[PDB]
Amino acid sequence: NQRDWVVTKSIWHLSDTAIKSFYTFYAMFTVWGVCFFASMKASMADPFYDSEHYRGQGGDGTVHWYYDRQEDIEATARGDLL
Amino acid sequence: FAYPHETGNTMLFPLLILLLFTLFIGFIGISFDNGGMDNGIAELTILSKWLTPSVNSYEFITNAISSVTLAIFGLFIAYIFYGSAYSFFQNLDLINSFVKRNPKKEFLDQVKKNIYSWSYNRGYIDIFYTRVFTLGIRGLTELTEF
Amino acid sequence: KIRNKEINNGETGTRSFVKNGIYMADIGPSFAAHAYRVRSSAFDLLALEDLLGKEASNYVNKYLRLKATFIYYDFDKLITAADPDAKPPLLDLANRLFDSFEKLQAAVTTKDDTDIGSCYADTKLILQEVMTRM
Amino acid sequence: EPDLQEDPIDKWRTNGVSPEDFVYGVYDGHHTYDEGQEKKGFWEDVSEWYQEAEPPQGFQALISWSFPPAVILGMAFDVPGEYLYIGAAIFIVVFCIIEMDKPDKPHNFEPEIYMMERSKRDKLIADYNSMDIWDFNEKYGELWDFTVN
Amino acid sequence: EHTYQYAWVIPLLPLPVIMSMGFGLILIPTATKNLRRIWAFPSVLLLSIAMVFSVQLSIQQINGSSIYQYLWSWTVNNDFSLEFGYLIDPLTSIMLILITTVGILVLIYSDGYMSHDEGYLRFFVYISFFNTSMLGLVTSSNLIQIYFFWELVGMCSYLLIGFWFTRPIAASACQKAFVTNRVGDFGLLLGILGFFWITGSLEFRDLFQIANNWIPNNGINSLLTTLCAFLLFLGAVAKSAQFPLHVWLPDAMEGPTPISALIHAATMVAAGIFLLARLLPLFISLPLIMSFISLVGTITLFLGATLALAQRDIKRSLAYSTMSQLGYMMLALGIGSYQAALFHLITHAYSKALLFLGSGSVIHSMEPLVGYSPDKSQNMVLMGGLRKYIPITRTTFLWGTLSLCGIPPLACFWSKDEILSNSWLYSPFFGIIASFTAGLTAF
Amino acid sequence: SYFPWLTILVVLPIFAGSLIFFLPHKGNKIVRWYTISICLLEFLLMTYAFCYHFQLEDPLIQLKEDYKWIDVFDFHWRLGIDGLSLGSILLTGFITTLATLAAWPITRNSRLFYFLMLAMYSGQIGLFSSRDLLLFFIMWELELIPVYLLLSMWGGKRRLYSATKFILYTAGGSIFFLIGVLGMGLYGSNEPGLDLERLINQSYPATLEILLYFGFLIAYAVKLPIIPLHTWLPDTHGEAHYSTCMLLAGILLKMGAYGLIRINMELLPHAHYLFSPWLVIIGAIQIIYAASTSLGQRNFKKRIAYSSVSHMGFIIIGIGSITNIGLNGAILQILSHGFIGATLFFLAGTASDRMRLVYLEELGGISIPMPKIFTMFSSFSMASLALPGMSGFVAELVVFFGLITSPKFLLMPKALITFVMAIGMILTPIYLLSMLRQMFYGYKLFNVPNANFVDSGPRELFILICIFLPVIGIGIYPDFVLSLSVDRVEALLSNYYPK
Ligand SMILES: CCCCCCCCCCCCCCCC(=O)OC[C@H](CO[C@@H]1O[C@H](CS(=O)(=O)O)[C@@H](O)[C@H](O)[C@H]1O)OC(=O)CCCCCCCCCCCCCCC
């Protein structure tokens, strides 16, 4: 309503009301069933995960492949055998 | 060899329009002595700070006089120290005297040696939070790690 | 885990819509700090049937309970702190209100459309009078 | 593999990994007093930026563009939910069987097979994309057999 | 007039541009950043409407009316409810005018200033977002819903301080300028929860009534109602720049000059003073806090005053001066006669924004002669003497700095004189300090 | 209705992923699409079951069913969704679909990997939908092997030590859970006993309530990190692939809270009501201890792990302080953290793998080459700062309101604990912005070469945006996640007996 508070230092009066989405909390979840549209933004090109400046695909592969050092020591042994 | 010429045509319009504000706004609470005019029905002596809750006074006159006296005194010492000499408001006779018989120059400068040393140190309270707080938590993290 | 000190609002089978477990801060015993929160709470249940009067009234029985428990307790705390004379009629008022609240809750629990409003008319008529007898 | 060593250990809380703001080799020359005005419009810039994916090509675009204006209208002139959740259902299947039936590219496969002697071309392109189940080139047993010409 | 049930569109008025740029700034970065100057118009116009929708909302209050407020329940769950909404009382319209005017002006000044820069559009988005958040804070019904905007303007100020995000000092000042008002909002939230437990409500119409009159006797809460209010006062202190928490304004002035003029007359003063002025109905029952407010005011006043000395960086001495000036407002609030404190705030807002904009103009004018470098520019000891070269931006600096010094015909005079009179009327103990700083500032 | 949904919803992922095996088709390509289609189908079926086959207005169980499985120790296929479960079920489906998407460019194995992902999917839903205690335990421990394999096959430098510590620690923690199972299973097994619905009326004697309570609480403190039982988290988070870690620190942690809500507060009241205050104290000191040790770390992955640890104190303090909102604000908190922590770990793992530098001191100015990562990172940092607007605020606010209006406290600790809790707001930005400033601000070398430095493409950007939007949508109007009317019966038992 429009209750009229006569406060002891000023000239107030107010008006309030209660509102809440009745059941459209279902309809908004249905609309957010747009994750079924997560397929057009996945078939798009990958930025660099397919770029030529990338080989090795794990979570530590490219970073910690890093043991061509052993193969290089072996190549050194082979060159010494030559 | 260049010169500080004017800025663009857009950083002056707001300056001017706001200069228009820094003079008129004083008319909100203009005064308390009959307002200032018997005509001009645009809220003359009902001073426009009526939004707030719900000759001139001799005491207020003398209080404002003391205020503006300290104001002009500060302005005057500022003009003495920093102001130029080619103008007509630095008599410079006294200036030509308060270097000749300056008695306490041996003491006064030390006051300088204090005051500046303070302001450059940014009001040491700033260094306090540095040498206490951001050096306290930096050790507290190490402690709760160990 | 909270008791009442004037047992006349409890009708047969002494209970009500009330939902225990609601924190009501201490306001002090006085017939000025209870006749005020009772007002400013009974003001809300006027604004109740403004938007959530129709349109899936499944939250109405989740807010009427709440903002009527305040009334149910503060009105007892009030009816205690009053002179002997003004107590009978204030109690009579109490009786008609806290019965209309049970009626309204029981009617809205059925998920109707016109019965809800027809019943709310009576608790509005009475509840607009509560904001004056204070 | 040389991997030169390190040096007089730096502040644990080095303010910003940066050059200390003495030799910050321009103030206002790195971020602000910099811009001019060149070219390139708006629309021929937008429809030259949605095509650095070839995101769909053909039919796979029609079923992907006309879907949102059919599942935003759906929340009006209302139709039962069952209809709405088989619509999105048959989409996610049709769009999938067109994706997985597109050709393959070298970056898709293993790392140890990504790096061939540039015979990867006639090993994968027109060699993989021309059969169904042949496994004559089944070289996923890595010991460098390479089993190809 | 009934022009209230449509007033709620004020804090949401510029928003339909912000989301329509950030998206473009994130999805399509090379197109929106090519409509560079055009993007200024849809913003400076929209916010403009707010201003003309506020004077008509304020003129009414001048003609005499009654304040309104609208409450809506945005949560109905088991055993309590939460409200939101706003109110339009005299102070709301005052701060509304004072924010929208300086906003619509600094927008054009920024269009002039940041014209060679690169982050034009991002800068405009930040400005509009800070503006629509501040416009929200000033019109807010219950405490929780003003806290919801307090931290928003805090985050806006943070993002604006470290704007260029690449100068290794502007990357070390934003962090401090966030953590300080973070401590402030910590105190604010603790005080809010304290008063909630003590009174049981959140809105002013009930808090002012309950807390003042009805409360139990010394069940220990008396110590709590003395303590909790100190926390709200601490928050209002930290958002402003008072004595214990002032270390973020001088270095926070590192940001761009228009922002340095919007976070020293629009938010620095509003979020600090406004809250205390609105919560004044509470503090009249706590004489201890009435004295402590005046004490911290007349401490930060004199402290800011005696630090503008010998500080040879214009965008730093200006910040010290505005802190020493906010000292006066904090003192004036601590004696009840805030009817002049608000007037002093209204004067000082413009009287300082003008000086900040003038300083920015002076910097960019002399910046081609010395290298592109702070402390090689904006250092007025190798500068000095510009009356001959740039007059139109000089008369404004003079007629602003004289007004700030205090001269009868100009502004910022009739306010500080009234508050000095009231200070002397209270007690000489800090009346003499006020009188002395009133001359040190003129120096 | 009797057409079983939950049975389908549990046996669809693992079954339809078992076809990845025995399918010789390619190296990596077709499996990605065949897995994402199954994930989307499952999520759509989930939301269809929720929308038109649920009420939000009755505190009983919905869609329940049961069978006969072993019949010696009464243990059935009993299965049913309820109010508390629903939010976590939806969040699991959502975030696990998005994690499987984020795992797109994996070609190392790409056949065992997606199958294990689907297995973890099915296990999570099985646990969150359980209705029989032994079956709850089965679903609990079923996921223990897939996560170990995902750790030991992909992720981090020292994957092995982290993986073995994690598996040993969790398996050991589940021992006390099995102890509680054996304890309350044999307590009058003629009365159903192993039907989590028909245990609400059990009146156990003293000195046995406490032992079962502790047998469950130890396992939960193992799963959900509580201070003396948290040492395992930094290793198993700083070493996991971001695809794994998303669902790991967004779902698997919240199981320790969902179980504590479901089988402790609902079954053992007078064993939990005499132990709530110490839970509250532990959570209060955890909120500050986790942050004070986070600030000390030096590799930002472990810093993010500790930030995830810290927010798990609000859940604790909401489980204690027995109110409707305190318990209810905990659920909103687990949702608004399953969003934020998952997204933050995704961003950490995406910034890394582009710079190959883990220690926060050498991270130059990455803002110059890649703007969008910087934007979407600062945004979620703000979210984690409990900043208003975003959903990281309202959860903590309701937690405060639940503690304040609690009935099992009288004003002495009800204020000091609130104080020590609010210190978290002073403490958290100090360690979040300290990372945001070292790793992003400042001008590093002239990193002009557009190689090993590319802003997020379409997939990662869409993932970030699609997880971000729910945060705003919930923080603006938080009644999308207050569809809980079980607490009006969940907190009905406790609320009058002694003390
Ligand atoms: C009237 C009497 C008054 C008496 C005094 C009262 C004072 C009250 C307020 C205390 C002062 C607060 C100043 C904050 C300054 C700041 O933000 O620094 C910024 C630094 C940034 O951190 C650092 O930031 C660095 C960057 S930089 O250096 O900041 O640029 C970064 O490199 C580094 O890693 C990082 O650690 O912040 C800190 O290091 C610590 C923040 C302060 C923590 C305060 C905790 C709460 C204190 C409450 C006290 C209550 C007292 C009463 C108890 C009953």
Coordinates of N, CA and C in Angstrom, one line a residue, chain E residues 23 25-27 29 73-80 82 144 147-149 151-152 155 158-159 162 165-168 171-172 174-175 178-179 182-183 185-187 189-190 192-193 196-197 202 220-221 224, chain F residues 324-325 328 367 372 374-375 378 382 385-389 393 396-397 400-401 404-405 411 414 418-419 422-423 425-426 429-430 433-434 436-437 441-443 461 465 475-479 482 484-485 488:
Chain E
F23 N 30.4 -6.0 -24.9 CA 30.2 -7.1 -25.9 C 31.0 -6.9 -27.1
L25 N 33.4 -4.8 -27.4 CA 34.8 -4.7 -27.1 C 35.4 -6.1 -26.8
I26 N 34.6 -7.1 -26.6 CA 35.1 -8.5 -26.3 C 35.0 -9.4 -27.5
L27 N 33.8 -9.4 -28.1 CA 33.5 -10.2 -29.3 C 34.2 -9.7 -30.5
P29 N 36.6 -7.0 -31.4 CA 37.5 -5.9 -30.9 C 38.0 -4.9 -31.9
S73 N 10.3 -6.8 -2.7 CA 10.9 -8.0 -2.1 C 11.6 -8.9 -3.1
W74 N 12.9 -9.0 -3.1 CA 13.6 -9.7 -4.1 C 14.1 -11.1 -3.5
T75 N 13.5 -11.5 -2.4 CA 13.7 -12.9 -1.9 C 12.6 -13.2 -0.9
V76 N 11.9 -14.3 -1.2 CA 10.9 -14.8 -0.2 C 11.2 -16.3 0.0
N77 N 12.0 -16.5 1.0 CA 12.3 -17.9 1.4 C 11.9 -18.2 2.8
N78 N 12.4 -19.3 3.4 CA 12.1 -19.8 4.7 C 12.6 -18.8 5.7
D79 N 11.7 -18.0 6.3 CA 11.9 -17.3 7.6 C 12.9 -16.1 7.4
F80 N 12.8 -15.3 6.3 CA 13.0 -13.9 6.3 C 12.8 -13.4 4.9
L82 N 14.1 -10.1 1.9 CA 15.1 -9.1 1.6 C 14.4 -8.1 0.6
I144 N 21.6 -2.8 3.3 CA 22.2 -3.9 2.4 C 22.3 -3.4 1.0
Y147 N 25.2 -1.1 0.5 CA 26.5 -1.8 0.5 C 26.7 -2.5 -0.8
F148 N 25.6 -2.9 -1.5 CA 25.7 -3.5 -2.8 C 26.3 -2.6 -3.9
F149 N 26.2 -1.2 -3.6 CA 26.8 -0.3 -4.6 C 28.1 0.3 -4.1
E151 N 30.7 -1.2 -2.7 CA 31.8 -2.0 -3.3 C 31.9 -1.9 -4.8
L152 N 30.7 -1.7 -5.4 CA 30.8 -1.5 -6.9 C 31.6 -0.2 -7.2
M155 N 35.2 -1.0 -6.7 CA 35.8 -1.7 -7.9 C 36.0 -0.8 -9.1
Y158 N 39.0 1.2 -8.5 CA 40.2 0.3 -8.7 C 40.5 0.2 -10.1
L159 N 39.6 -0.2 -11.0 CA 39.8 -0.4 -12.4 C 40.3 1.0 -13.0
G162 N 44.5 2.0 -11.8 CA 45.4 1.3 -12.7 C 44.8 1.2 -14.1
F165 N 47.5 0.4 -16.9 CA 47.8 -1.0 -16.5 C 49.2 -1.5 -17.0
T166 N 50.0 -0.5 -17.4 CA 51.3 -0.9 -17.9 C 52.4 0.0 -17.4
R167 N 52.1 1.1 -16.8 CA 53.1 1.9 -16.1 C 53.4 1.2 -14.7
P168 N 54.6 0.8 -14.5 CA 54.8 -0.1 -13.3 C 54.5 0.6 -11.9
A171 N 50.5 0.1 -11.6 CA 50.2 -1.3 -11.3 C 50.4 -1.6 -9.8
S172 N 51.1 -0.7 -9.1 CA 51.4 -0.8 -7.7 C 50.5 0.1 -6.8
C174 N 47.0 0.8 -7.7 CA 45.7 0.3 -7.8 C 45.4 -0.7 -6.7
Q175 N 46.4 -1.6 -6.4 CA 46.3 -2.6 -5.4 C 46.0 -1.9 -4.0
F178 N 42.7 -0.3 -3.7 CA 41.6 -1.2 -3.5 C 41.6 -1.8 -2.1
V179 N 42.7 -2.1 -1.5 CA 42.8 -2.7 -0.2 C 42.3 -1.8 0.9
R182 N 38.8 -1.5 0.8 CA 38.3 -2.9 1.2 C 38.2 -3.0 2.7
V183 N 39.3 -2.5 3.5 CA 39.2 -2.4 4.9 C 38.0 -1.6 5.3
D185 N 35.0 -1.1 3.6 CA 33.8 -1.8 3.5 C 33.7 -3.0 4.4
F186 N 34.8 -3.5 4.9 CA 34.8 -4.5 5.9 C 34.2 -4.0 7.2
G187 N 34.7 -2.8 7.6 CA 34.1 -2.1 8.8 C 32.6 -1.8 8.5
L189 N 30.4 -3.5 6.6 CA 29.6 -4.7 6.7 C 29.5 -5.2 8.1
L190 N 30.6 -5.1 8.9 CA 30.5 -5.5 10.3 C 29.5 -4.6 11.0
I192 N 27.0 -3.0 9.7 CA 25.6 -3.3 9.2 C 25.1 -4.5 9.9
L193 N 25.9 -5.6 10.0 CA 25.4 -6.8 10.7 C 25.1 -6.6 12.2
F196 N 21.9 -4.8 12.5 CA 20.8 -5.7 12.1 C 20.5 -6.6 13.3
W197 N 21.5 -7.2 13.9 CA 21.2 -8.0 15.1 C 20.5 -7.2 16.2
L202 N 16.5 -3.6 8.6 CA 17.5 -3.1 7.7 C 17.3 -1.7 7.2
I220 N 24.7 -6.4 27.7 CA 26.0 -5.7 27.3 C 25.9 -4.9 26.0
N221 N 24.8 -5.1 25.2 CA 24.7 -4.5 23.9 C 25.0 -3.0 23.8
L224 N 28.1 -2.8 22.5 CA 28.0 -3.1 21.1 C 27.5 -1.9 20.2
Chain F
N324 N 17.5 -22.1 8.8 CA 17.0 -22.4 7.4 C 17.9 -21.8 6.4
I325 N 18.3 -20.6 6.6 CA 19.1 -19.9 5.6 C 20.6 -20.3 5.6
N328 N 20.7 -23.2 3.9 CA 20.3 -22.9 2.5 C 21.3 -22.0 1.8
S367 N 49.3 -8.9 -20.8 CA 48.2 -8.2 -21.3 C 48.4 -7.7 -22.7
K372 N 41.9 -10.7 -24.2 CA 40.7 -11.3 -23.8 C 40.9 -12.2 -22.6
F374 N 43.1 -11.7 -20.3 CA 43.2 -10.8 -19.2 C 41.9 -10.3 -18.7
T375 N 41.0 -10.0 -19.6 CA 39.6 -9.5 -19.3 C 38.9 -10.6 -18.5
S378 N 40.4 -11.1 -15.0 CA 40.1 -10.1 -14.0 C 38.7 -10.2 -13.6
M382 N 37.5 -10.8 -9.7 CA 36.5 -10.0 -9.0 C 35.4 -10.8 -8.5
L385 N 36.5 -12.4 -5.4 CA 36.6 -11.4 -4.3 C 35.4 -11.1 -3.5
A386 N 34.3 -11.9 -3.8 CA 33.0 -11.7 -3.2 C 32.4 -10.4 -3.5
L387 N 32.8 -9.8 -4.7 CA 32.3 -8.6 -5.1 C 30.8 -8.7 -5.4
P388 N 30.1 -7.6 -5.1 CA 28.6 -7.7 -5.3 C 28.3 -7.7 -6.8
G389 N 27.0 -8.0 -7.1 CA 26.6 -8.2 -8.5 C 26.8 -9.7 -8.9
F393 N 29.0 -13.0 -3.9 CA 28.6 -12.1 -2.8 C 27.4 -12.6 -2.1
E396 N 28.0 -15.7 0.5 CA 28.6 -15.2 1.8 C 27.6 -14.4 2.6
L397 N 26.9 -13.5 1.9 CA 25.9 -12.7 2.7 C 24.9 -13.5 3.4
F400 N 26.5 -15.2 6.4 CA 26.5 -14.3 7.5 C 25.1 -14.2 8.2
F401 N 24.1 -14.0 7.4 CA 22.7 -13.9 8.0 C 22.3 -15.2 8.7
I404 N 24.2 -15.2 12.1 CA 23.8 -14.1 13.0 C 22.5 -14.5 13.7
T405 N 21.5 -14.9 12.9 CA 20.2 -15.3 13.4 C 20.1 -16.7 14.0
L411 N 25.4 -14.6 21.5 CA 26.0 -13.2 21.3 C 27.4 -13.2 21.7
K414 N 28.9 -15.4 18.6 CA 28.1 -14.9 17.5 C 28.6 -13.6 16.9
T418 N 31.9 -13.9 13.7 CA 31.6 -13.0 12.6 C 32.8 -12.1 12.2
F419 N 33.5 -11.6 13.3 CA 34.7 -10.7 13.1 C 35.8 -11.5 12.3
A422 N 34.8 -12.0 8.8 CA 34.9 -10.8 7.9 C 36.4 -10.4 7.6
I423 N 37.3 -10.8 8.5 CA 38.7 -10.6 8.1 C 39.1 -11.3 6.8
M425 N 37.5 -10.9 4.0 CA 37.4 -9.9 3.0 C 38.6 -9.0 2.9
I426 N 39.2 -8.7 4.1 CA 40.4 -7.9 4.0 C 41.6 -8.7 3.5
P429 N 41.7 -10.2 -1.3 CA 42.3 -9.4 -2.4 C 43.8 -9.3 -2.3
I430 N 44.3 -9.3 -1.1 CA 45.8 -9.1 -0.9 C 46.5 -10.2 -1.7
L433 N 45.0 -10.0 -6.0 CA 45.6 -8.9 -6.8 C 47.1 -9.0 -6.9
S434 N 47.7 -9.6 -5.8 CA 49.1 -9.8 -5.9 C 49.5 -10.7 -7.0
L436 N 47.3 -11.0 -9.9 CA 46.9 -10.2 -11.0 C 47.9 -9.2 -11.4
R437 N 48.7 -8.7 -10.5 CA 49.7 -7.6 -10.7 C 51.0 -8.1 -11.2
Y441 N 50.0 -7.2 -15.2 CA 50.4 -5.8 -15.3 C 51.9 -5.7 -15.6
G442 N 52.4 -4.4 -15.8 CA 53.8 -4.2 -16.2 C 54.0 -4.5 -17.6
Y443 N 55.1 -3.9 -18.2 CA 55.5 -4.1 -19.6 C 56.7 -4.9 -19.7
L461 N 36.8 -19.0 -25.5 CA 36.0 -17.8 -25.2 C 34.6 -18.1 -24.9
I465 N 32.5 -17.4 -21.5 CA 31.3 -16.6 -21.5 C 30.1 -17.4 -20.9
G475 N 23.8 -13.8 -9.2 CA 24.1 -12.7 -8.3 C 23.2 -11.6 -8.3
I476 N 22.5 -11.3 -9.5 CA 21.6 -10.2 -9.6 C 20.3 -10.6 -8.9
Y477 N 19.8 -11.8 -9.0 CA 18.5 -12.2 -8.5 C 18.6 -13.7 -8.1
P478 N 19.0 -13.9 -6.8 CA 19.4 -15.2 -6.3 C 18.1 -15.9 -5.7
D479 N 17.1 -16.1 -6.6 CA 16.0 -17.0 -6.3 C 15.9 -18.1 -7.4
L482 N 17.4 -20.7 -4.9 CA 16.7 -20.9 -3.6 C 15.4 -21.6 -3.8
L484 N 14.4 -24.4 -2.8 CA 14.7 -25.4 -1.8 C 13.7 -25.3 -0.7
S485 N 12.7 -26.2 -0.6 CA 11.8 -26.3 0.5 C 11.9 -27.5 1.3
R488 N 12.8 -26.6 5.2 CA 11.7 -26.4 6.0 C 11.3 -27.7 6.7

